[PDB]
Design a binder for these strands. Structure first.
Lengths: 171, 36, 191, 69, 197, 232
RNA sequence: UUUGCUCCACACAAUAUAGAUGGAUACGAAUAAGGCGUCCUUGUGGCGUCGCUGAACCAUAGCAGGCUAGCAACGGUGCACUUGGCGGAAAGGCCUUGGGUGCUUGCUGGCGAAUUGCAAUGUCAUUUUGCGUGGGGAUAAAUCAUUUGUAUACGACUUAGA
RNA sequence: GCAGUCAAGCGUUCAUAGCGACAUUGCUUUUUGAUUGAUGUCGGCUCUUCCUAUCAUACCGAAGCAGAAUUCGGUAA
RNA sequence: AAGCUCGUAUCAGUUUUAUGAGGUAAAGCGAAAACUUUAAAUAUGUAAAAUGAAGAGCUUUUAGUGGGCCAUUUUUGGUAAGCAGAACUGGCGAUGCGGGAUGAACCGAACGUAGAGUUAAGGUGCCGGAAUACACGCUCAUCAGACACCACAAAAGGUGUUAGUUCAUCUAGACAGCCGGACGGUGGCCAUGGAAGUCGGAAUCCGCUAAGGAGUGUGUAACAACUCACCGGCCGAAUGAACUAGCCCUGAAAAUGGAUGGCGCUCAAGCGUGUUACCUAUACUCUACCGUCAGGGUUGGAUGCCCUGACGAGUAGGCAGG
RNA sequence: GGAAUACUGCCAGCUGGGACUGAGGACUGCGACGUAAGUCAAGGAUGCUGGCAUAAUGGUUAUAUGCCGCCCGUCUUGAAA
């Protein structure tokens, strides 16, 4: 959907003679809090055998992008499952927010590796501060001084069935 | 330019249901042999 | 990788003029004019001066960028043909039956007529493409020279002449008769 | 117009006013066509009647001129 | 909105145009398609020719005069694509098909009428650049249509006459434009421009 | 996916890599440390027998050859650091193939030796040809009609395709011998030598161009200065 | 065959309509390009301008459109005629000449409308078929029966006969 | 096919917990080139059509293919 | 169906609580995995809090019935592969309706007569009601694909295309190209008419080297020549190898002419995914009406009358009114 | 440092257009507005107006058009043929 980023903090279930559990925190990209909590429980169990009943979510907050209208190069480390084993992937995404980059990554995974939301785990999203630290050329290409490109073959939308002139694809 | 016959992509009900049964049997045997 | 832009250079020597409009290319040099219809390719032509012309592809894939260099090389060949021409020398060899090669005029057109190939009673006719002139080498045995502005025309004429004298149902180890492209060069060979 | 890459909103406003972009836009046939479309959409029934009357008058004058020349 | 709509079929994709025409005819609009020899089909010429040859081999085995009739002309190929999209065995489908005419070239009287296009079916607007495509005239001639040259000669004659007509129309348009430019400063011109005219 | 398939050849010698350059750097450092005079020489098209003759022309002295950039880094290309002072002045003047001669012997003696030394090697492209050559019309002989033709045997039939294709010479095989229909001259005096003309002269194997060892300059471990001597 | 047949005009009938309700409003070609205008040393030319929808353009006021008085201009437009061309793809239509005849909302005036009662398609289009008038025009064949045999199961075919 | 031989790889990661592609003993078997047919309820003819997995005819590719003849292969009903 | 009893009854194809079960090996923490104490519940019993329920128990009686097919799950035994024997639970039978073009076992949903609204499953180029919607990617098939698939051809092959993982080399110069070098014992040793790196069998050595195999191939009768292994100059900038995944081609198939349902579709009208809008079932909501049943009221056609609520599939068979 | 806006939610906030329905038949009830009189949208539609009064609405019938609909009964087996 339209993704949001949630910080989710959970812990073990308190018991007698058991104070101060290990406060496990995670950052989950999900359309809503119900899905975020389910994903948190799933990842917690995968990390360590902590069932949903054996745990408790003590906090969940929505994290907004700090400078939402600044263009940022993001490196995204993920891992996803298939019929073959799990694979680790590094991707570079140029966008103005982490949620936008994560949505782009989910769509790219679906289009390329046929993977889905339940199969992708987002290990880390980080802004790459220096231009020189980028690796993928499909991102490094848009970083040159005085970048300019045309948009050849413009296709205009027609509201009516019939047009009374041949269309031009000029731009 | 003698164009030859082309295989039909119109699936028959008999073949479709037979394939369904084949898949079910394949999964059951996969479970049994994984147990063994 | 789906590059944003790819460019190739086309140099223009001091004697030739290139006119490009809607991907029709006319090259006019000291030796004449050539015209190429490149509307089956999707490229953009630009010039910064009278000595250099850029050919660019925007947001192209592998096949598009593959065609880009081809377009550049074709225009280069047009420039070379209009400034220095092309000269293909062929030699015909035989064991017993001397190959007889003549320029004849049949139905108002030029033909290379080949007689007595391996003793054949059949007359072979190879139409001379327009723009290429046929000559016979002086002080050289069994050499025919094809000269033209269009490398496509000259090379296809030489290929037609070579293929028309194929050896059929024999051993090519034993029977060496035929017409062969001896050499490919230009009409100017100063050094 | 000249704009530094990544310029913030106030900088964009400053460069925009300096380059007089709104005037350049208002001075074109495209923007004038948009304005004409909006005005014609806004015309009243009485005003469409007035347009018909004025078009007949202008037509009369122009046909007379065309016949003369 | 016209009583008759004349579509210049040049540079249109066969199936998308057929879909549009079928819906219009069923909704009650009279349509004339001209220049069916200039329709396009996406895909390679060899591929579309193979598809036609498969169609050609399909025939009733015990009596070929009963089997599918393989029409070679471009207008008839387009008509086949359209009849496949109409329910032609009903009275409503027959009445829809009675509202359509398809032609090769632009014969009289349509050669002096306005021709339109269908943008959602135009090759330049639909196909991605670089994709190979087939032309209906070449396909028809390869499969046995025998009037490609006659139509081409007639269309050349029509174009010569049409160019002369357009030269005269261009002259008259220039004269009228001047006559209107001399009247841009009048009070009526100012009032009309204030009202948007 | 549509990529050129690299040629796969099973041969013993493997490209050495960075460690060989490291060892060359160390060896030149040792030579400059333990010798007095280092001469820079140019040996562009020099055969291994000539290199070995110069190598054995001294035992105490040492000859080092290799990568120009590696040697220029070892000697020192900048003023931030260099083994000795004013070495960048010598390093800048090196031009092509590098040669380093380390010695303690007399400058005049080595200058006289490198002046006197001369060799007649193969001719080279874009160089003056000392003697012209013209294949006669007869059966083509291996040497080229210079040595007694009756003594020598004619050119092998295996080289006829090479001569006909790369050397651009009309050649035909008659009874097994290579022949030509008219005398064919390859070059004239003081004429720019083509790649193919050099190839054909070497194919006849008439080594005639005079090769010499040239020196650009030298350096000393006692006075630490650059002297420009132009010996050819 | 008791003015039969046919083409025009008005005059009323009947007929039934895959569906009028201002106008189907004409370059060609390209689309990694074009249209229009202008200029020159005339072309793959220079300069200017346009697109980014027909949301246009043209038409469009008057009893469903009456009857009259003028002004300005000599334009716009319809009808019955006429001049000269052009169009064969299914031309059956386009353009032009001259005079006559109307209208003119380009501008200013003067009379009428009501009662269809607060809406009712509120009847205005065009296909065909008949009957009556007045304006003209033209005066055949086919089939059976008979006959031939280049034909033939019967039909059909093919010959001949004032 | 049997047992193998190592493994290209794989096996919950795990080299002989275990698998396993592609490649290598012996068979009717003795050497010098000796003598050592099934089918009964199917089958005939005629005769139409279709397939190509092509016997012939057409065109090509290779092979000590000299020529001749042939072999193997490609398109082709 | 008829009687008798009672209805703060009597229960329940459900959960929980306490008491058991494959203790199978992940508890953690013990005397040095061999100890022997614990733990969320997949999956059944007993006995006592949750939720629901107006009918329940007993005694006499009457009809019809007395096959199975398909699938899920677990289990035991098997084959080249299919699979067979059990137990459970569903579907169908007696069953219409929407959808999957079509249909025994697929997806929705069970049915009085109607009206309006909304939906399920499935769809929205045209046939055909409904976006030739919006967005990001992939693919071009010389008979693509639009599916039964966590199935068979399927193990792989491809100089198609995309995105990745790990190795590597690189401006003290990478990849590709041109031009140079490519040396000496040595024509190493054995058989050969001859065999000098290159018809043959054995270690494959030593020196000088930037670097040069007792040689990667062509080539001669033997040589020679070229070549590549390796190093250098040339100009300047990233390049190569092995694997992984996606889509595409091959991954064998005959015989009347035919099928993603057809047309047709190629920045799709194909494939993956996201967001909305829209279409329509006898389903859901609301209303009217018919009937059945039920619960209240009725001393002033009572076999009735009034008020209210819920329901309505059906073979054999049963009961009732016509 | 000061705001604004988005998003999500709430209102016993206000207001416009469209469609289907009008069951019931004296009063009784619960309310709303009013000092009261009384009025009201509060236990289910009334008010005003027009045309026609007959084939006009409607019924029946024959056809046409759109979509749908396989020929009945018996008998077998799960079931179908």
């Amino acid at each position: 959907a339209h993704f949001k980023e949630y910080q989710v903090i959970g812990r073990r279930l308190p018991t007698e003679s058991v104070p101060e559990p290990k406060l496990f925190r995670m950052r989950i990209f999900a359309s809503n809090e119900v899905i975020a909590k389910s994903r948190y429980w799933y990842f917690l169990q995968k990390l360590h055998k902590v069932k949903k009943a054996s745990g408790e979510i003590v906090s969940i907050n929505q994290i907004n992008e700090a400078h939402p209208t600044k263009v940022k190069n993001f490196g995204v480390w993920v891992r996803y499952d298939s019929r073959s084993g799990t694979h680790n992937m590094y991707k570079e995404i140029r966008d103005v927010s982490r949620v936008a980059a994560v949505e782009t990554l989910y769509q790219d995974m679906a289009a390329r590796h046929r993977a889905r939301f339940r199969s992708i785990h987002i290990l880390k999203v980080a802004e790459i501060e220096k231009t020189a630290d980028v690796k993928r050329q499909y991102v490094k290409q848009f970083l040159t001084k005085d970048l300019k490109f045309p948009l050849p073959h413009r296709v205009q939308k027609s509201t009516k069935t019939f047009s009374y002139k041949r269309p031009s694809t000029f731009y | 330019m003698r164009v030859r016959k082309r295989q039909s992509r119109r699936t028959s009900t008999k073949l479709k249901e037979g394939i369904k049964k084949k898949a079910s049997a394949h999964r059951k045997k996969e479970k049994k042999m994984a147990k063994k | 990788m789906k590059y944003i832009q790819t460019e190739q250079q086309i140099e223009v020597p001091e004697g030739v003029t290139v006119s490009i409009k809607s991907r029709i290319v006319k090259v006019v040099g000291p030796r004449g004019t050539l015209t190429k219809n490149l509307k089956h390719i999707d490229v953009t032509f630009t010039k910064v001066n009278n000595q250099l012309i850029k050919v660019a592809v925007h947001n192209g894939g592998r096949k598009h960028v593959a065609a880009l260099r081809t377009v550049k090389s074709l225009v280069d060949n047009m420039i070379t043909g209009v400034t220095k021409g092309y000269k293909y020398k062929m030699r015909y060899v035989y064991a017993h039956f001397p190959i007889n090669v003549n320029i004849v005029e049949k139905d108002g057109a030029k033909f290379i007529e080949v007689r007595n190939f391996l003793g054949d009673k059949k007359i072979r006719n190879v139409p001379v493409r327009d723009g290429v002139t046929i000559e016979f080498s002086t002080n050289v045995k069994d050499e025919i020279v094809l000269s033209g502005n269009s490398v496509e025309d000259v090379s296809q004429n030489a290929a037609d002449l070579q293929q028309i004298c194929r050896v059929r149902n024999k051993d090519i180890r034993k029977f060496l008769d035929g017409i062969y492209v001896s050499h490919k060069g230009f009409i100017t060979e100063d050094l | 117009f000249a704009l530094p890459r990544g310029a913030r909103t106030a900088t964009v406003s400053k460069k925009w006013a300096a380059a007089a972009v709104c005037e350049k836009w208002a001075a074109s046939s495209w923007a004038k066509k948009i304005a004409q479309r909006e005005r014609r959409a806004a015309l009243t029934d009485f005003e469409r009647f007035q347009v018909m009357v004025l078009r007949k008058q202008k037509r009369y004058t122009v046909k007379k001129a065309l016949a003369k020349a | 909105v016209e009583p008759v709509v004349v579509i210049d079929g040049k540079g249109h994709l066969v199936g998308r145009l057929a879909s549009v025409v079928a819906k219009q005819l069923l909704n009650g609009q009279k349509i004339v398609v001209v220049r069916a020899e200039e329709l396009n089909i996406s895909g390679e010429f060899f591929r579309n020719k193979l598809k036609y040859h498969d169609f050609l081999r399909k025939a009733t085995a015990f009596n070929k005069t009963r089997g599918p009739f393989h029409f070679r002309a471009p207008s008839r190929i387009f008509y086949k694509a359209l009849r496949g999209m109409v329910s032609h065995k009903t009275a409503r489908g027959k009445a829809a098909l009675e509202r359509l005419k398809v032609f090769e070239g632009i014969p009289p009287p349509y050669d002096k009428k306005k021709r339109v296009v269908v943008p959602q079916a135009l090759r330049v607007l639909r196909l991605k650049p670089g994709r190979k495509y087939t032309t209906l005239g070449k396909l028809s001639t390869s499969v046995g249509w025998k009037y490609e040259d006659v139509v081409a000669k007639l269309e050349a004659k029509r174009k010569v006459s049409s160019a002369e007509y357009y030269a005269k129309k261009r002259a008259f348009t220039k004269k009228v434009a001047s006559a209107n430019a001399t009247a841009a400063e009048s009070d009526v011109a100012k009032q009309l421009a204030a009202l948007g005219y | 996916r549509s990529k050129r398939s690299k040629l796969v050849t099973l041969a013993q010698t493997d490209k050495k890599g960075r460690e060989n350059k490291e060892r060359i750097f160390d060896e030149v450092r040792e030579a400059l440390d333990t010798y007095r005079y280092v001469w820079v020489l140019h040996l562009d098209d020099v055969r291994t027998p000539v290199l070995q003759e110069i190598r054995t022309s001294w035992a105490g002295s040492k000859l080092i050859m290799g990568k120009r950039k590696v040697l220029q880094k070892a000697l020192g290309e900048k003023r931030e650091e260099e083994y000795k002072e004013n070495l960048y002045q010598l390093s800048k003047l090196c031009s092509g193939v590098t040669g380093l001669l380390f010695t303690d012997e007399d400058v005049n003696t080595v200058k006289e030796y490198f002046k006197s030394y001369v060799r007649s090697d193969y001719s080279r492209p874009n160089t003056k040809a000392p003697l012209t050559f013209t294949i006669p019309e007869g059966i083509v002989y291996s040497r080229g009609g210079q040595i007694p033709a009756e003594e020598d045997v004619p050119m092998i039939h295996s080289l006829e395709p090479t001569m006909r294709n790369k050397f651009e010479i009309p050649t035909k095989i008659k009874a097994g011998k290579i022949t030509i229909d008219s005398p064919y001259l390859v070059c004239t005096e003081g004429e720019k030598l083509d790649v193919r003309q050099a190839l054909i002269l070497k194919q006849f194997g008439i080594a005639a161009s005079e090769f010499k060892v040239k020196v650009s300059a030298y350096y000393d471990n006692d006075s630490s200065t650059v002297e420009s001597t132009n010996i050819n």
